[PDB]
Amino acid sequence: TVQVPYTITVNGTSQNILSNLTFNKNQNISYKDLEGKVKSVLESNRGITDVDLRLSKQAKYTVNFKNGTKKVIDLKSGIYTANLINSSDIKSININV
């Protein structure tokens, strides 16, 4: 019941849309699920699939936290960060392929 803005850049270009992801308020979710949302909007906004992420030079998303820190996560990697993340700690998400 909270909205978290995200942006998507693919091959240097970024739609000028104001886009949000819906999250349950104050819910701990895993980074496997957060990656699922990220991959979902890459597909629905820009038609980017899993094979496209494998062959890109770099593919990452950055979680910006309300406390001013950030976490940079690699979409080409396995090994989920041993952890869960709270929904109401996220300021925004920047996706970069």
Partner: protein, 223 residues
């Protein structure tokens, strides 16, 4: 809108504010009325359900002048290419006709198949973010300069000058930004462009859909 000023209230009565339902969340875009029953916007603003607000200045207040209308149909251009953001144009058929008044009325489209000379001054308006840090509740606007095609050909890998316009001097920090998609680029009071895409940073130049390239399709779809 980056580097702009607040619009005079209701000075741009063709402006449309779109609330879009996506599978994973909500989006927000601009658009513009081109006939009492049709709004023109960007195809990447498509969603399953679209509510359209006309007559607004402060979209976070519920002004008496606003008209709220759902889109009955959202017609993406048949060759819209999501990956490259090509043919990024969409028509929304309103579920009812707007009531015309001083605050709500459509904007002129180009005469036939017009190009756009570099150096031309054009205005863009929108409710998008003003920087990486804050947005706006009221309509803003900024005047930009059409660039020679080389400015975007060096920067954007899929820019096509036949169907897109390169807009915005790099030196000035003036541009459309997140939330401004689908808004009009007006040159002498005619809608020649549609806010489409740019750099993630918002630094100009940016790419607009060239409306004149789509005039036959727009006229056919409305008819």
């Amino acid at each position: 809108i980056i580097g702009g000023r607040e619009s005079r209230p209701h000075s741009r009565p063709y402006m449309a504010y779109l609330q879009i339902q996506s599978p994973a969340g909500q989006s927000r875009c601009g658009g513009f009325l081109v006939r009492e029953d049709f709004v023109l916007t960007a195809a990447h603003c498509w969603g399953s359900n679209i509510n359209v607000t006309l007559g607004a200045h402060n979209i976070q207040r519920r002004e008496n002048t606003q008209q709220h209308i759902t889109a009955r149909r959202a017609i993406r251009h048949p060759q819209y290419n999501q990956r490259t953001i090509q043919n990024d144009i969409m028509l929304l058929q309103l579920s009812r006709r707007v009531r015309r008044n001083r605050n709500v009325n459509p904007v002129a489209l180009p005469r036939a198949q017009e190009g756009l000379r570099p150096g031309t001054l054009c205005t863009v308006a929108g409710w998008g973010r003003v920087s990486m840090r804050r947005g706006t509740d009221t309509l803003r606007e900024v005047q930009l300069r059409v660039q020679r095609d080389r400015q975007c050909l060096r920067i954007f890998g899929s820019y096509d000058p036949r169907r897109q316009i390169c807009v915005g001097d790099r030196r000035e920090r003036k541009a459309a930004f997140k939330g401004d998609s689908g808004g009009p680029l007006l040159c002498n009071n005619v809608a020649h462009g549609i806010v489409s895409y740019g750099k993630s940073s918002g630094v100009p130049p940016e790419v607009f859909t060239r409306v004149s390239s789509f005039l036959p399709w727009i006229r056919t779809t409305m008819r």
